[PDB]
Design a protein around this ligand. Sequence first.
Ligand code: HEC
Length: 464
Amino acid sequence: APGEALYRQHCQACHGAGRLGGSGPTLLPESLSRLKPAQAREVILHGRPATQMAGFAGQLDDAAADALVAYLYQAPPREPQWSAEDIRASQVQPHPLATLPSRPRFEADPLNLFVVVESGDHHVTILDGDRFEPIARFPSRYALHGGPKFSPDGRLVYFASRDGWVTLYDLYNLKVVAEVRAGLNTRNLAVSDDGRWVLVGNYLPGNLVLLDARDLSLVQVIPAADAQGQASRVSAVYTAPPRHSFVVALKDVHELWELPYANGKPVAPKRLAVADYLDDFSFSPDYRYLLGSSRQGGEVIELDSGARVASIPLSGMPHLGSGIYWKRDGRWVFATPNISRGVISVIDLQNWKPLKEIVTDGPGFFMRSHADSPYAWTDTFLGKKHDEILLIDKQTLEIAHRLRPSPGKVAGHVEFTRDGRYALLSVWDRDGALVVYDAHSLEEVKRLPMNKPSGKYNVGNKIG
Ligand code: HEC
């Protein structure tokens, strides 16, 4: 085909042999699932503003650009592999933990640090959570995915990237400890509650990759396949601390997995049959129940027996993974945003009966709160109107307040300081910002300019 030859001559230098990546990102069909071919075409011709991807309009014509786009989105004749041997060969260890002191090199409170993902230019900022000033900034792997995870004591932070790279960062020494490429297209990762294991959930290959959390060395590649042998992508991996287990959502088979690690490296799944494909898990506070979205509403499964105990039909497809729990009149309640409709659904835990449907302007994506806050903070991140953060009173279940940090720009995602006194909102824009708010007065206290900040993650709240 003409695309391949054009690719070798003009592209392989940076995007690598087989489109696996190199200087530039991986360019497999899975890698480009969020990039429409017309957008890829414009990137190839004119480049990406303010990056190392320059335009090629002067080197190739319309037919050559179309040929290249067609090649990038075409499935290869055989699926690319990423073996145990590939994984081990990719490990690097610039600052092994054995060689580093175990003392914070800074004066900021280690438990109030924010890890801030700067997705516009693929950097990470480490923020002093009391001064709201950076103590470190470093370039990350391209297109971080899934939000960072922490070691149990909050000293170490683990990043996963779209194209399969895992990064271990030591917050005390402000240094990259190790990196490894666990797959070719990665969904997210999870850290065991005893701090020993990293479990990586991959789309490509369809597998789980188990790493030693101290140096990102390979422990075992676990192919994702149901009991009948049918291959599957991993949708997401989660930690269930009271069960000392990983819980795995599988994209393409009627199974979900629990991998216990109390007795050692979690290499053997306990398989639980599900009636329908189930991903985007949420866990009840006691981790006895799993709330998932089925390909057909919400499904409540008991983890031990795997029995389906209740079904909750809700408008549109609710984003159960982002839902949160709190006590309202001395009884657990659960609230979830929605991907296609503009509503916040509130469910009663005791009976799994819906309590109230709070109507909003548009579909949202994020939800957060704090023991010290009387509101649940959410958004309409996915709607046509999307510059407002909504504060839903935990008791009245109504939008009590609204926050509009940058009128006209996408506002979304909220994280608090460890004591809940301040809330940090992201304006997801090239001319974006991290906006600090007093969580009780609700007034803007500070604003940090950033290129498309996405999530920020408070050590204290993430490990508490
Ligand atoms: C190195 C100097 C490169 C060469 C030669 C080519 N590309 Fe590239 N490309 C490169 C980088 C560093 C990046 C990432 C830029 C960023 O956002 O930080 C890219 C990006 C792309 C993309 C977008 C991928 C995405 O995930 O959004 C595409 C579609 C792409 N590049 C295609 C492409 C083609 C077809 C090339 C030869 C014709 C080519 N690139 C050359 C680095 C480099």
